[model samples]
Target: SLPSLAPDLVRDLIATAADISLLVSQEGVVREVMANPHHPSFGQLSEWEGRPLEEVLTAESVAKFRLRSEGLEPGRGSVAVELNHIDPRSFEFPIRYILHRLPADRSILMLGRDLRPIAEVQQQLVAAQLAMERDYETQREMETRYRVVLDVSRDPMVLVSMSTGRIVDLNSAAGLLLGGVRQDLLGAAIAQEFEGRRRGEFMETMTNLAATESAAPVEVLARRSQKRLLVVPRVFRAAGERLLLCQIDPADAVGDELSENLARLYHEGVDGIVFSDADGTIRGANEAFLNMTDSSSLAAIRGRSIADFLARGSVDLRVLIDSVRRTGQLRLYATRLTTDFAGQIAAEISATWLDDRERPLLVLVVRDTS
Candidate 1:
């Protein structure tokens, strides 16, 4: 019965069959008629010639056909049986077997096919569905977290679209402090929400950040709201895109709070604050220096070089500025300087270098003593 089955017919029948098929000799070696030279299984057999079938097919599969020929009938099919690694899990088929047996010594005919590829395709579809579900769940969690944090945050928070400057997202605190609700603010130009003089500066900073991918907190006045908003901004790049995240604090509200806290620790805590140009022109001043020098406004003492202010005192302002320009840092120093208002004053002056641009601004902190 086994010999009567032509190799081509057996192949054709097995090709249409759901399972795999093979013909083997009484010695359990793969028969040539059932072997396809191009098949991967045939290539594997070349490395295993003369070895026991159990070594290649596994001991369990060899035992299934060990003595099964006595019960096989010609042209009759046997029940489907299980085999291991005949079709590795990576393949499309998981099971295959033979249908014939030799009449002489009960040799087996085997068949098999890989169903794993079809199974994997089906599995991938299921995974895709599950991934969608997970994404939706994660989005909901993020929305809820944002809602809770935005409701209670004391500092204003706004999410701006880096591409368009549109108010893409914001919390209630932003609406309350900056004056608008989510519906009214969404998709609105950020410039419209700020004051006139600062609109250009704000746009410039955002543009510079987009171009350079750098970030820093800045003190800026928003005109419309008439509020000094200290904003810490950060930028990110992803998926061939750029984004900005900004956190805002009202400078006036926090400034007084900080000053009040500092007052409790020291007496006569007034410190000198000054703004100067690259050429050392006295561009601005605060109350502490005005009181020390008996000057009413920065305009009265302005237009004077720093050397003029230090003419009656020790230590050269020009030398300090040059040191900072070279090293970018300054140490605390107790120096004497002639104040236009107070005559001569003993002051501790500290200066730090800022980014070297066309118009550079340096911060000077001065502490006065009687």
Candidate 2:
């Protein structure tokens, strides 16, 4: 038994499946249109019902629409195609459609889907993927060159596993300082290289190395030689593994000991010190600068613009950056420091760029004058 609905009811059901619907005559002229009303593309489609589709569609789309109209047949569910507009001044976008042919009326019902949102997301995903690939390629090249440097240098350096606290690669000089065969000690535990009281002390330094970049040289005695040695950790990650690039040397009065005070000097220095990337966004602020800006903590200012805190805003920051790019250093630049809560402070600024072999970084210091 065949159940039947009214012709108007059948048309309404087809209209519900799409954002916008068009009823066309056998001659390719639009007869009626029904839309969701809230869709962005529906805004301009209101008057198109009384006109020939050629008036609203692009020239290329007119040919495609005519071809689809000529071939439309009943009982075949639908034909889908993407059609773009020819009119440059009118909504210059492509629309995806499912064409339904009605035998009784000898016309077609076109159900349209907007393609703008889908295109936008696809563009953004492609851009993000390209950026990630470029960064990985840069790291790969640097790693190849670093391997060469470690093989030829006389420095007592060892590459250690962050998770296992064991040596992964060691140079000749490091083997001499530790009194072990360079090949045999590759996978040996670093703590086992020292003995008794010295073993426990060496393990503590390795534990701290896993947590932070507070890379001060820790003096420990070599097991067989009883010689005092300085060990400094430079931590990084690559190829999905964490590594400690350790540099060891015979202990001297203050060899590499100066780095330990760098954090203290930056945090407690009298001047305002900030580290930013080439972008004007502030990464961290010292205590003195935080006080000067009325910021309670580094988080309060991080990701915010350094320009906002400067007297001339974006223009002055731009000028300073350009000068540094041309000459590599800028100093004694007079500017007033603005605060989130406090009044402005008259200040002189100095800035420098450090290209960290991977990317350039900026360090800015502000000294108060009044």
Candidate 3:
């Protein structure tokens, strides 16, 4: 049931209930304007009563008013319309209103609700969503680069899940050392590759070994290849999950010692030793080579084409490659190495070609003559 009240009292109740209220005559003139006192900006609309409704609103709002007014019949309930209010002082605001036709004087009542609060929250949500998408895209790019680094690395490296004791990821070198192909090794139990170790026992042993600073690598025999392997496991955490970074190496005493000495010679030797492909891309470079090239680390020079360091650029590299291919070796082929100071260092390179089963290698031993 509706409560009976005086017409003036009903008008007072309706005016104070909305953020903005207005009474328009049939001729579209704003006869009366009532704003909620809580809204300070709307209170300034008191002087708008003598003007036309379209004159007090934005151009777009005038179009909406013109269209909505045409179909407004008395019997149907009040029509809802959204309008943007533009003050003569140059400020604008959005308002959603219901246009009710009064039977007493053929006037229309406009009751408005503020849309600013809803608009502000929606804008904030859109900005947060964009930020989240950018963060996800950056993470994905970094993850792809990390995987590429692991896959192309020469070291035999494997990642084992701490909780499951299963292989999470392993490079091609690690796969070969473990006596299995890369695809087949994924998610396989790490302990099963060894001769006689249970998953729990193997993980516990690795954990205990990792705790000691100078602990030796654990020796294990590969079940498939029957080869002795030195397993060095280091434990680390990522995203609250523990994982093992295992470096696997052959434990053959004689072969290991020889290879170790050869590796040392490459680093400690006075002469520069570099290995490259036929395309002249440096596959490996020793410490002495890094010094000759004025490089800080192997990473700085590796995979770069050799022409960058040669004084005659491609000409000198082409001559050496041609000579080595014809006779399988070149003896003290004279050349110059470029320096940062714009000066050149007199050098002689002894080049040799090694025909490996898979890929051929060009070894260059550089001796400084100046």
By lDDT, the best candidate is 3
Q: Rank the candidates by lDDT, best first.
A: 3, 2, 1
Residue-by-residue lDDT tens digits, candidate 2, 1-370: 6579898887666666677788888777889987755566545665777777777787788778778767878877778867774443545667788888988788887889977667568778899999999999999999888877887789889887767777889887888888878887889877667655433556566545433233345677878667888887676778887777778888854246576577667755688888887877787767678767777556668899889898788998998888876678887888888987647889988988766767678888888999
lDDT against the true structure, each candidate: 0.62, 0.76, 0.83
lDDT of 1 by residue, 79-101 (tens): 45555434232322344554566
TM for every model, in the order presented, reads: 0.51, 0.49, 0.45
Clashing pairs in 2: 58-86
Winner on TM-score (2 vs 3): 2
Name the runs in model 1 displaced over 4 angstroms: 1-21, 32-43, 58-70, 77-79, 86-95, 102-106, 119-139, 195-204, 207-231, 237-240, 251-370
Please report how far candidate 1 places residue 228 from its true position, in Å. Answer: 5.8
Question: Higher-lDDT candidate among 2 and 3?
Answer: 3
Give the candidate number with the greatest TM-score: 1
Give me the displacement of residue 195 in model 3, in angstroms: 2.8
- The lDDT, on a scale of 0 to 1, for candidate 3 is 0.83
| Candidate 3, residue 62: lDDT | 92
